[PDB]
């Protein structure tokens, strides 16, 4: 799917993670 850095981060954060980044077009969350 399409990954937008800001969108990925906000979705990751909304879910309880600390941040999110797009890696090769895939949203990855971090905590």
């Amino acid at each position: 799917a399409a990954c937008y850095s800001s969108d990925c981060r906000v979705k990751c954060v909304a879910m309880g993670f600390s941040s999110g980044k797009c890696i090769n077009s895939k949203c990855k969350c971090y905590k």
Side-chain angles (χ1 to χ4, degrees):
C3 191
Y4 305 133
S5 55
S6 67
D7 180 61
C8 172
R9 179 172 45 182
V10 296
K11 283 170 174 168
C12 283
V13 168
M15 289 180 78
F17 290 85
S18 296
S19 188
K21 310 164 188 167
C22 291
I23 299 183
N24 276 7
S25 306
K26 300 180 192 287
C27 179
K28 179 178 196 179
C29 302
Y30 293 74
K31 78 191 306 182

